[PDB]
Amino acid sequence: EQFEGFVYKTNKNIGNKHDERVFIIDRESIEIPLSRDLRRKWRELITSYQEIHKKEVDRGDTGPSAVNGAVWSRQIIADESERNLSDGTLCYAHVKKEDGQYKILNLYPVMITR
RNA sequence: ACUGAAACUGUAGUAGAACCAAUCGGGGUCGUCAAUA
What technique determined this structure? cryo-EM
A44 CA to B25 C1' distance (Å) = 32
A46 CA to B26 C1' distance (Å) = 37
Which parts of the protein come within 7 Å of strand B, by CB position? A 10, 13-14, 16-19, 21, 49, 52-53, 64, 66-67, 70, 73, 75-76, 109-114
Per-residue buried b or exposed e for A15-47, using 16+ beta carbons within 10 Å of the residue's own CB: eeeeeeeeeeeeeeeeeeeeeeebeebbeebbe
Stated as kind and residue range, the H or E segment containing A93 is strand A92-98
A15 CA to B26 C1' distance (Å) = 43
What one-letter code names the amino acid at A59? Answer: R
The reported resolution of this PDB entry, expressed in Å, is 3.0
